[PDB]
Structures are given as structure tokens and as C-alpha cells.
Amino acid sequence: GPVEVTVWHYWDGTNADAFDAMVDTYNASQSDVRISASNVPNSDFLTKLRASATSDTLPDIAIGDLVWVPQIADIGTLADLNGRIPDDTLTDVNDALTSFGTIDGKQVSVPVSANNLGYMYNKTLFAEAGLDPENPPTTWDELKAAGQTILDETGKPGYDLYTQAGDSGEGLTWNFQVNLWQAGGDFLTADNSAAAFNTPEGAEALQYWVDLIDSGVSPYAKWGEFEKGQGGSAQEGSWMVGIWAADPPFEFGTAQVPYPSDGEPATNLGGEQAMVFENSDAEDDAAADFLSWFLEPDQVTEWSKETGMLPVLDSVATGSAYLEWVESTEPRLLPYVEQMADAHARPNTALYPTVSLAFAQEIEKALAGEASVDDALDAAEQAVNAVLKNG
Ligand SMILES: OC[C@H]1O[C@H](OC[C@H]2O[C@H](O[C@H]3[C@H](O)[C@@H](O)[C@@H](O)O[C@@H]3CO)[C@H](O)[C@@H](O)[C@@H]2O)[C@H](O)[C@@H](O)[C@@H]1O
């Protein structure tokens, strides 16, 4: 009988139905491996893995959020996927995501879905303000000026900023990182040992946020006005194209995230990564056989099409097949697809969640008007370095 391989994931809905259909397809396509997939709730997933390490009942495959990988790598020994998944598959996978998935030299994760942040806007409100509803802003200066027009002409915020840290800080941090990278900035140093953002580039990105808030274009603590149909625009994840293209709350448009004339295009990557917990070389190779099949172009194309998630393979994101389909079926996803070339991943440190909250709490003081841009970047660097240095 087949090698039995367990997969834990947190997908629900369409995504879980799609994944179960692909498991069925793989299971019926050969007799050497049988995949048994289970849903574990997103909020329960890490705590289940910690208990499972203690009870020696870890799954063979875990599929987790990007920022979980480094934490999971400390819960249980992860197999190296290099030499298990075909070299040409791993080369094709988005480089930011294979780099992210490299811990102690081993390819301990591979992405199996992707998403990124984009610019979404309300065409009806743009038109009401006297803007061209088909011509979104392309630069920071264009966004500030178009947002100012929306505020001046309609009394509504031109652009939402994610300005409150909340429980994790990640809404603020991961929206800010986009603009830090577009300014030519870095978040941590290349070895994740220290902050790298307390720079002219960092101050350019934070001064952008503070200028938007100070003008009233992006009020402090007013996230979600855009989503209510009461706001010009917002950074939104690619998953929103799918949620809205079905039952839209208003006529929305999408674009590349506006970037500074003195800078470069950038965005931030989300999505799910697969990890194989090390057992025997036979069992690791059984698990990696399923992941190899899952990462072939035909699977990645059909999976992306049906879930609205962005493909993890460069060859699919840039392929005529997939692009023609996006143009025919979900054309507002195209800017998100094109951004896969410029997208960055967060740093692969196991302290990232603590780093991100320490960062977000200090930066929020500048957004709230309680600190200067220079003092908040100094404070954020102190908080982050204390978290990184002291472990
Ligand atoms: O962009 C606003 C968002 O920012 C933070 O979350 C960052 C994570 O966003 C992604 O996860 C999203 C899923 O893809 C969606 O299908 C859905 O469940 O929403 C989550 C985020 O809530 C990304 O895949 C992750 O890698 C990112 O870390 C805030 O914490 C969120 O509250 C905001 O929604």
C-alpha cells in the first residue's frame, strides 16, 4: 500500500475545496503516496504544532503563513527540500520566497500560494472629485495631490493608511515596509541582526505617511473608510480582487503601488508556505513528491485560477496562458501579478512577530502626532534592536 503522508493546512471555503480536489487528483494519479489533508484553524495552528512536537505526532507537511516558517523551524526539524523537489521547479519559484524559505542553508519551506499588496481605488469617488476614473496615481506625489483633490472636493479621505498597531502590529508594519522598500530602504540588515530602516530612505517613507495624515488626506485611526465606499483608495491585498470582483461594494480599480519618482517599485509578499517535518529519507521524499506535483506549472496555473491566489512560479506569472486568462476573467488582478517581479519578503527571523509589534508601536506615535519622524525612527530602531539582540 502507499506511504501515508499527512498535511495540515488552515484553508476554508473555496480554497479548502480546491486543495481537497487537488489532493484527490494526486491520490488517484499514482499508488506510491496517499495524502491525508486536515484543516487546523489559523488561530490554533502554531499551538497545535508545539503540542504535537512534545507528543511526537507532528504532521508530515504543515502549510502555514509566510511569517510562521522561522517559528515552525524551531518547533520541529524541517527537511531540506533541495534535492527532493526538482531543481528546475525551485529555480522557477519566486526568488524572494525561496530565499525567505532558506534557514541554516536548507530550503525548509516552499511557497504554495502567494499574494501581494496593491493599490485599490474607488472610480466613482475619483470621478466625483474631478479625477480621471481610469488614471490612478503612479507616484507618491500623484497620490498626495489626487488624494488632496478628493478631500477638497468631497470631504472624504483620499487614501486610507493602516495607522494602528492592533494586537500584532502587522497591518501597520507590512503596509509601511512597501513604502520603505520603494524609497530604497531596508527593514533589517541582511543577517536579521539589527534594524536597517533608520536612514534617509526610512525617513522619506515615514514623512510620506506623516504628510498624508497632516494634510487630512489619510486621517489617523481611520482605516476602512475606503472599504465602506467612503474613501478614495487604500493599499489592499490581491485577495480583495476576488472577494470584491464577485459582490463589489462599489466600482473599484487596481494598480501597481504608487512609488516615489526618486525610488523603485516594490510590494510585500503574503501567502502559504509548505514545510516537511523530517522523518526517514523515504518519508521526506514521499511528502516532497506531493509538493513537487503541486508545484508543476499545470497544477500552479489551475490552483491560482480557481483560488484567486497569485502563482508562485515566475514562468506562470509571466506566461501567456495565465496572463490571457487574467485579462479575460479577472483583469483587475493583472497589476498584482505583474508586481510579483518587484515583491519583497519580510525577514525570516523567528523574532519577526516581536520585531513587528515593537516597530509598529513606535512608528504609530509619529502617525498619532505624538513624536517627530526622526524621533519615531530612532525609537523604532531602539525597540527592534533590543528585541533582536537580546533574543
Ligand atoms: O493588509 C491588511 C492586513 O494586514 C495584516 O495582515 C498581513 C497578512 O496579510 C495576508 O494574510 C491575509 C490572507 O491572505 C487573507 O486571505 C485574509 O485571511 O486576511 C489575511 C490578513 O488578515 C498575508 O497572506 C500574510 O502573509 C500577511 O502577514 C493585518 O494583520 C490584517 O489584519 C490586515 O487584514
Residue numbers in the entry: 31 to 421
What does the paper behind this entry write?
Gene products encoded by cmmC, cmmD, and cmmE were suggested to form an ABC transporter system of an SBP (CmmC) and TMDs (CmmD and CmmE). Because our study revealed that the protein specifically binds to CMM, CmmC was termed CMM-binding protein (CMMBP). Therefore, the present study suggested that CMMBP plays a key role in the “three-stage” metabolic pathway of A. globiformis because this protein is tuned for specific binding and intake of the cyclic compound, CMM.
The CMMBP crystal contained one molecule in an asymmetric unit, and the refined structure was determined at a resolution of 1.47 Å. CMMBP adopts a typical “SBP fold” consisting of two α/β domains, designated as the N- and C-domains. The two domains are connected by three hinge regions (144–146, 300–302, and 359–361), and a long β-strand penetrates both domains. Because the electron density of the glucose unit at the nonreducing end (Glc4) was ambiguous, we modeled a trisaccharide (Glc1–3), which corresponds to a panose, in the crystal structure (thick sticks in Fig 4B). Glc1 forms a stacking interaction with Trp269, and no hydrogen bond interaction was observed. Glc3 forms a relatively distant stacking interaction with Tyr192 and a direct hydrogen bond with Trp204. As evident from the position of the N-domains, the CMMBP structure adopts an open conformation.
